[PDB]
Design a binder for this molecule. Structure first.
Ligand SMILES: CC(C)(COP(=O)([O-])OP(=O)([O-])OC[C@H]1O[C@@H](n2cnc3c(N)ncnc32)[C@H](O)[C@@H]1OP(=O)([O-])[O-])[C@@H](O)C(=O)NCCC(=O)NCCSC(=O)C[C@@](C)(O)CC(=O)[O-]
Ligand SMILES: CC(C)(COP(=O)([O-])OP(=O)([O-])OC[C@H]1O[C@@H](n2cnc3c(N)ncnc32)[C@H](O)[C@@H]1OP(=O)([O-])[O-])[C@@H](O)C(=O)NCCC(=O)NCCSC(=O)C[C@@](C)(O)CC(=O)[O-]
Lengths: 418, 418
């Protein structure tokens, strides 16, 4: 009896509005090609205060339950990974539980480590199940965030917001994860952070890229050693990482995925028993292979390019885009995933796409999620950005979605769309 | 080959200063017996800004590693449960990793759900190990918090601060946990919370007591059903809960443990097949049994009464006090633990105290930890309370301990005591 654990399905929620990234460039006196070619952006989600971390998380989690016909009483863990917390004590997960009218027999809590928080919660849910404690039950892990750098900042064109809700179970139709094979690399850095009382992040941008790549290298190498010992990959005519059908990466901006994939391949090329016969120039040229990027990574960025950085959710939006179109082809094949969070930590893990992944992705109806949005001007984006966090716009949520309506006596109030 | 997982050892850190609780009563025009008898308090830890969540967590975690001779390279997870976070993105766990100069092959993140956050992280570490993923490695889970209600508030006499660091492993000398038997009960409430930008908690105090007891009842009942089915307890001449050698509870104030134990016993008395032959009066009198409280709970409060509410750490300070004196007697016996967090969630779990628990507790040297503190006046407590979070006092940390020294260019700086 082969037991499996992992991601059974997912759902996505996005803010109601977005801007065209070339409009942002023009408003900032920037060449639009810096954003479209340099960063790989197309459209940037923008929010108003009604689209807070709770509202986006609850919209995604409710959509998951409805689209996948989840029995809410089978949920034994509800975890929200976020870096956009709204209370020091009361977790987003508790608000989500209430808004969705979920029953009582579940753990609820939030996880925090920049863009790694969702992955940390995913592993906690997976290992709860794989330990036996969660046998017979499911978990819901929601990655929800709003990425804000501020007007006229270098990070501004990488903003975004939204949520991805993951169903975790013993029927992991999207991704049957290889338990215990993860690689991890973490160290205390100040590449990106956001002190309490600052609405916008602080970042040393180029250093943050170096930190991502450094942590990726350590995490990937740790996974590779375990995968070699488990017989899942080999040092052969193909590099170890080439034996993964696809690799999905944390996407702070779309061009980061190419940088990440080049670095992963360089790890193989530098570590091969015969590396001494190569040069930095020859290794770099091979690592940057357009064929490899096209085969393993390129199709994972379609949703990300239209939304922006959704912090904890960015890797899972890449997984979503990949499986949206390729789940049937990928059934039975092993793929890799690299999660990074500033501060920092990276974790690399693998899993096998399930036979029913295409079914679960069809039910997620992702083009309909993206089609509901409306474009706004940069002027309006700026006006909404300037609103205080307690001042949601007077607009109704979409059917089954949620919005913050007001804060009254320090208690946050929400509405569910009819 | 009987596999075991759970808590191998613990260490405690407390702030350098405390006040006498009767001095606080006099300063507030309150009868001191309200605090000493009504709440069960003796001494209240007070902080200055140098004793932040990071400094307390790092002090406790470094002390654990030194006292227990942990190989730092065997740590594969470092999790901080807290409701006193200091960054929206960068976790306390990442700062602890850096301050302790720990290596890179570990997950780092923080968990959040009021006073339940530490337990959530403990279960994530336990289940990482029990799934097989953490086989051969250990985890460190630190519960670190500073409880602040504010001058002249009803919650003020229940303040406190400190940290408890837990070593989690396949050699769980303190508590070999019963994996998969936990009971849990959670629901979305506003009993206690602390919005971003508020230094002091908001609380509906009497309602928070009702919420604790309600969630406890559900969590305990869920554990009891599983423990009955596993044959660990029986409905016999003894109530199910009486078959636990001891029960430790989240301690917001010491008298809360008696309220909690009475409620747990009432759950047994109300649920017994023959409950119809009793009355509320007879059940209450039996539930309130002094003999049962004295046998199962009373000795768990010695540290808590001298520190105050340490939020996520309060239950673990109760476990510490119990094992400090009774670990040898408890070896081979099963005990219960009830974790509660406002917002809210409760989880009830059990485990068996290990043969070497007394050894591990002796190495924690807890009376020395408490002896290092100094008493201050209420006037000085108030002066320190009024200091901004970025204004630590100019005092050195104790040997091997840590303090925040300053914030410079939005980066927190720390010192390690010589
Ligand atoms: C990403 C930066 C640093 C870029 O901001 P920047 O410094 O203004 O941009 P640049 O000068 O680095 O240019 C970017 C690319 O555009 C090119 N370019 C320029 N002009 C043109 C043009 N006319 N036509 C065509 N191309 C053009 C340019 O040559 C370059 O190409 P590349 O170096 O990639 O090969 C900034 O947006 C930033 O700081 N963003 C936020 C930080 C971030 O996303 N870091 C990523 C790594 S850390 C991470 O992923 C974690 C994170 C951020 O998500 C946080 C968390 O975990 O919580
Ligand atoms: C605990 C309260 C509500 C009490 O604050 P209060 O309302 O001022 O006190 P009280 O009137 O309820 O009195 C307390 C006890 O003192 C007695 N008393 C009175 N005077 C005398 C006297 N002269 N001589 C002898 N006894 C006296 C009095 O009769 C009573 O006895 P009891 O009802 O327990 O039997 C307040 O301190 C508060 O709000 N604290 C913070 C909230 C809290 O600790 N709640 C506990 C449950 S929730 C929890 O544990 C989660 C939490 C708080 O830790 C947060 C998280 O998870 O993050």
């Amino acid at each position: 009896m082969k037991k499996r654990v992992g991601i059974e399905a997912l759902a996505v929620a996005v803010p109601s509005r977005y801007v065209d990234i070339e409009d942002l460039a023009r408003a900032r006196g920037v060449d639009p090609a810096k954003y479209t070619a340099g960063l790989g952006a197309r459209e940037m989600a923008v929010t108003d205060p009604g689209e807070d971390t709770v509202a986006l998380a609850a919209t995604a989690a409710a959509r998951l339950i409805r689209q996948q016909d989840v029995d809410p009483s089978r949920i034994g863990m509800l975890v929200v990974g976020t870096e956009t917390g709204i209370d020091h004590s009361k977790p987003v997960a508790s608000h989500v539980q209430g808004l969705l009218k979920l029953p009582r027999t579940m753990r609820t809590y939030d996880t925090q480590h920049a863009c790694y928080g969702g992955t940390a919660g995913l592993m906690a849910a997976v290992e709860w199940i794989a330990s036996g404690a969660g046998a017979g039950k499911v978990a819901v892990v929601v990655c929800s965030d709003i990425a804000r750098y501020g007007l006229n900042t270098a990070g501004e064109p990488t903003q975004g917001g939204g949520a991805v809700a993951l169903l975790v179970s013993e029927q992991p139709d999207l991704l049957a994860m290889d338990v215990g094979l993860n690689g991890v690399c973490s160290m205390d850095v100040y590449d990106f952070w956001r002190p309490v009382g600052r609405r916008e992040a602080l970042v040393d941008g180029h250093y943050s890229i170096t930190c991502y790549l450094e942590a990726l290298s350590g995490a990937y190498r740790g996974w590779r050693e375990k995968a070699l010992a488990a017989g899942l990959v080999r040092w052969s005519d193909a590099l170890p990482g080439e034996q993964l059908a696809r690799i999905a990466y944390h996407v702070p901006f779309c061009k980061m995925a190419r940088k990440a994939h080049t670095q992963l391949r360089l790890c193989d090329l530098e570590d091969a028993a015969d590396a001494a016969a190569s040069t930095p120039e020859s290794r770099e040229a091979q690592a940057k292979s357009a064929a490899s990027y096209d085969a393993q990574v390129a199709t994972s960025l379609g949703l990300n390019s239209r939304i922006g950085n959704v912090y904890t959710a960015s890797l899972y939006l890449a997984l979503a885009g990949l499986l949206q179109h390729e789940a049937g082809a990928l059934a039975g094949q092993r793929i890799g995933l690299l999660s990074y969070g500033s501060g920092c930590a990276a974790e690399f893990y693998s899993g096998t796409v399930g036979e029913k992944a295409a079914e679960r992705m069809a039910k997620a109806d992702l083009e309909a999620v993206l089609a509901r949005r409306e474009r706004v001007s940069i002027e309006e984006y700026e006006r909404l950005m300037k609103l205080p966090a307690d001042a949601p716009e007077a607009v109704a949520p979409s059917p089954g979605a949620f919005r913050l309506t007001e804060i009254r006596d320090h208690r946050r109030q929400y509405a569910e769309g009819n």
